[PDB]
């Protein structure tokens, strides 16, 4: 059960959320924010790793897209 300094802006933003029916409490709103923070932080690492892998995969230089489609359709 933690203690946090929020300024007026978010003081108020939390209340616009909780007086509306979005969330039942301050704590629930902050959890919602954190969740999005965590989700993005993790999509973001996933993305960079995915791109590195692409870089390390090496290259095809002459790609025949018409034939990729042919062959995939044949299968």
């Amino acid at each position: 059960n933690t203690s946090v300094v929020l300024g007026d802006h978010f003081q108020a933003f939390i209340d616009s959320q909780v007086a509306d029916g979005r969330y039942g409490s301050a704590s629930e709103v902050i959890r919602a924010g954190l969740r999005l923070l965590e989700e993005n932080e993790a999509k973001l690492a996933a993305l960079r790793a995915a791109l590195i892998e692409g870089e390390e995969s090496g290259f095809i230089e002459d790609f025949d897209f018409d034939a990729f489609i042919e062959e995939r359709s044949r299968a």
Partner: protein, 94 residues
């Protein structure tokens, strides 16, 4: 005209084809693929049009197609790195 195409990226088309063919049949799988083809062929032509994501990774541009996003950079020619689902997208920090 010319671009390079990472093996992983090519594994991406393969997986894209698999899901599509399974969800919708070959016709549709083939249609969606030509769209990826067109997106890519246009990146090759007009490299500068792709939106940069320099905070994601140095030298990178993205160009969307359907439900997917083409990630590329340009060295001595245009390099297609990954073709990934839009569900992968994330805001990069400055």
């Amino acid at each position: 005209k010319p671009y390079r195409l990472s093996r992983r990226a090519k594994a991406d088309l393969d997986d894209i084809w698999t899901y599509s063919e399974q969800r919708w049949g070959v016709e549709q799988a083939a249609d969606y693929a030509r769209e990826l083809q067109a997106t890519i062929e246009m990146i090759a032509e007009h490299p500068g049009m792709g939106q940069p994501d320099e905070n994601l990774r140095a030298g990178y541009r993205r160009c969307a197609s359907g439900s997917h996003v083409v990630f590329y950079r340009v060295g001595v020619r245009v390099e297609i790195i990954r073709v990934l689902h839009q569900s992968m997208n994330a805001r990069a920090h400055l």
